[PDB]
């Protein structure tokens, strides 16, 4: 009644086991993995 599946929106990243994990980054190796001051927009726990 509410849940639906949009499988056309699936996305797949291929990788070799020996590849650096950063190499699956959609925007490349300059993306910041962790900013200790970044806050979440809003909680999802009720």
């Amino acid at each position: 009644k509410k849940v639906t599946f949009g499988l056309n929106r699936n996305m797949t990243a291929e990788f070799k086991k020996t590849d650096k994990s950063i190499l699956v980054s959609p925007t490349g190796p300059s993306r910041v993995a962790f900013d200790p001051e970044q806050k979440p927009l809003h909680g999802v726990l009720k």
């Binding site: 699936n10 086991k17 994990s21 980054s25 979440p40 726990l45």
Partner: protein, 299 residues
């Protein structure tokens, strides 16, 4: 800035450092750093419900089993917390080579983003199981037995199920013949071990099986299998749309059951070197539209 006794930001930085390293490199935290992760996350677990009621948007992940660099790939591809909200379905430790780094990063994100990052209990977050299947040996080799017991006491406080926007029921294993009211889950007191039978056991251990009409006996030696009719009746009775569970390796990283009334997620590709499966996570947007983000081995 302010450090804090847990030295949390430093721990996360060191765990994430190896994004730029050859997969397999260890991150060796101090014992007291790891104990801090266990004790603070334990307190957070007990402060939130054992039956988590969550809102979308959310990315849901299946088994990891110590494949730390696949966990890092999942975050790199899905977005590092808090860029995305995460719910994991259990089985963080055992089988793989780096259960330690895996659970430590997960506990650290739990502490860092406690309203946006969630971990359920899987059947391997249990001392009688991870004594045998690898986590104990890893703790003993790289730390000591006492730290393993500290993890156990933490795991005994993990929540057990989650409901997303009153429509997606999530747990590690599956349904139980004793699960009749959600209140029965809410009444489970923590800390608890996983019993060898009963509601808590089945939530962590049971499997769907299209070849059984109702409830069958499970090849794992505990708990049950349940057929498509059991799923249909369960969803109908609780006004739910979907069961989201993990616990079984699936070739595509996700796998539907009973006309998409149930999905199995599994997020450890090339599972412990024995299978050639992809790993996936389910992205649930704010309309409860579900899609899959997949890590697919090539080599």
């Amino acid at each position: 800035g302010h450090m804090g006794s847990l030295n949390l930001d430093s721990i996360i930085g060191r765990l994430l450092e190896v994004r730029g390293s050859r997969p397999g490199k260890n991150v060796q935290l101090t014992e007291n750093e790891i104990r801090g992760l266990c004790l603070k996350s334990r307190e957070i677990f007990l402060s939130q419900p054992i039956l988590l009621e969550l809102e979308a948007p959310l990315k849901i992940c299946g088994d990891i089993h110590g494949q730390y660099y696949d966990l890092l790939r999942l975050f790199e591809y899905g977005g590092f917390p808090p860029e995305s909200n995460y719910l994991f379905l259990g089985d963080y430790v055992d089988r793989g080579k780096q259960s330690l780094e895996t659970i430590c990063l997960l506990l650290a994100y739990k502490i860092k983003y406690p309203e946006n990052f969630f971990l359920l209990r899987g059947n391997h977050e249990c001392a009688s199981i991870n004594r045998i299947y690898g986590f104990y040996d890893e703790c003993k080799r790289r730390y000591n037995i006492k730290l393993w017991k500290t993890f156990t006491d933490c795991f005994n406080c993990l929540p057990i199920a989650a409901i997303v926007d009153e429509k997606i029921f999530c747990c590690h294993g599956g349904l139980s013949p004793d699960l009749q009211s959600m209140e029965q889950i809410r009444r489970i007191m923590r800390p608890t071990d996983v019993p060898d039978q009963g509601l808590l056991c089945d939530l962590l251990w049971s499997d769907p099986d299209k070849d059984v009409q109702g409830w069958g006996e499970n090849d794992r030696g505990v708990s049950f299998t349940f057929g498509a009719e059991v799923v249909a009746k369960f969803l109908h009775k609780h006004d739910l749309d979907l069961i989201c569970r993990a616990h079984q390796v699936v070739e595509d990283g996700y796998e539907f059951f009973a006309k998409r009334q149930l999905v199995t997620l599994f997020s450890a590709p090339n599972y412990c070197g024995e299978f050639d499966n992809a790993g996936a996570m389910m992205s649930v947007d704010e309309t409860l539209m579900c899609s899959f983000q997949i890590l697919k081995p090539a080599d």
